[PDB]
């Protein structure tokens, strides 16, 4: 996941290797988030680091407000297209990959999230849960 988090996150399948670009689902003015690092994450020769629902990533904004581009900032993954399996046996998946810009403590830069947002993410990050609409 990351650091700033309230709780733990049971393992969820990885969908977003470094280099993945996800839709930006806040109202910050960024359109993309491009993942360059995953806060969680350990090491294996040749393994790309990869994130998953509720992970904090480090990202840059490829498309979007100029004041917001050309720099690395933390983001949080709130939806993933790669299917994953919950402790209750259900394998679910979203229709896109989406993230929200955040500061290192987990406070969100924006103040609204567009789309649904998976519970696992919601639980890890109060401030995201707070700004979330539908959850799972």
């Amino acid at each position: 996941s990351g650091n700033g988090a309230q709780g733990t996150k049971f393992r969820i399948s990885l969908g977003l290797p470094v280099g993945a670009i996800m839709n930006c689902a806040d109202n910050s003015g960024a359109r993309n988030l491009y993942i360059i690092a995953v806060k969680g994450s350990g090491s294996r020769l040749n393994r790309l680091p990869a994130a998953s629902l509720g992970d904090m990533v480090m990202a840059t904004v490829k498309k979007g407000k100029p004041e917001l581009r050309k720099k690395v900032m933390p983001a949080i993954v709130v939806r993933q297209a790669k299917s994953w399996r919950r402790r209750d046996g259900v394998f679910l998946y979203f229709e896109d990959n989406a993230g929200v810009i955040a500061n290192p403590k987990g406070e969100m830069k924006g103040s609204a999230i567009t789309g649904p947002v998976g519970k696992e993410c919601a639980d890890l990050w109060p401030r995201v849960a707070s700004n979330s609409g539908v959850v799972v």
């Binding site: 299917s83 209750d88 046996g89 259900v90 394998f91 679910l92 998946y93 979203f94 229709e95 896109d96 789309g115 649904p116 609409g133 539908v134 799972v136």
Partner: protein, 52 residues
């Protein structure tokens, strides 16, 4: 424990079976297997698929 129903075929879904899609709006869809899942993706119409 609940038996869900396949939202394309009306089929009984027991725990662990199939998959659950979550659309953009947030309409949740559940398929019982990968057949209904696929026909859904191809934008088939349940009303014209005779086994549903």
């Amino acid at each position: 424990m609940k038996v869900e129903i396949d939202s394309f075929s009306g089929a009984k879904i027991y725990p662990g079976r199939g998959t659950l899609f979550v659309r953009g709006d947030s309409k949740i869809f559940r398929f019982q297997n990968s057949k209904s899942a696929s026909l859904f993706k191809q934008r088939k119409n349940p009303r014209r698929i005779a086994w549903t």
